[PDB]
């Protein structure tokens, strides 16, 4: 009491108003979750591809088309001229 089942089961008597929130715009409470839970749910919403059922080989295939759309990375043993290493600073063609 007042945490028992029969206390939570009883309703509030009387009629209802024909015409609360912690902050001015809604109700906000402090909560405790793991970091991984928030990161995984934010990732599921954020990543374009959150869901859409996909195994490893066709994901590697999509990676392969995305990689061949990009410019040539270059050769790291070529220090000057055409074929010089550009690397992660290679832009995507559009």
């Amino acid at each position: 009491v007042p945490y028992t089942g029969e206390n939570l089961a009883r309703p509030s008597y009387g009629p209802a108003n024909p015409f609360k929130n912690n902050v001015l715009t809604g109700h906000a409470e402090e909560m405790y979750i793991s970091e991984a839970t928030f990161r995984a749910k934010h990732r599921a919403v954020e990543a374009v591809g959150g869901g859409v059922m996909r195994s490893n080989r066709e994901m590697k295939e999509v990676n392969k088309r995305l990689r061949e759309m990009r410019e040539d990375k270059g050769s790291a043993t070529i220090a000057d001229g055409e074929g010089a290493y550009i690397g992660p600073w290679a832009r995507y063609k559009r």
């Binding site: 945490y3 028992t4 939570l8 909560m31």
Partner: peptide, 13 residues
């Protein structure tokens, strides 16, 4: 099978 208690007091699972 009755809900004997629902005890609050935690801010997490």
């Amino acid at each position: 099978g009755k809900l004997l208690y629902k005890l609050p007091g935690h801010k997490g699972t």
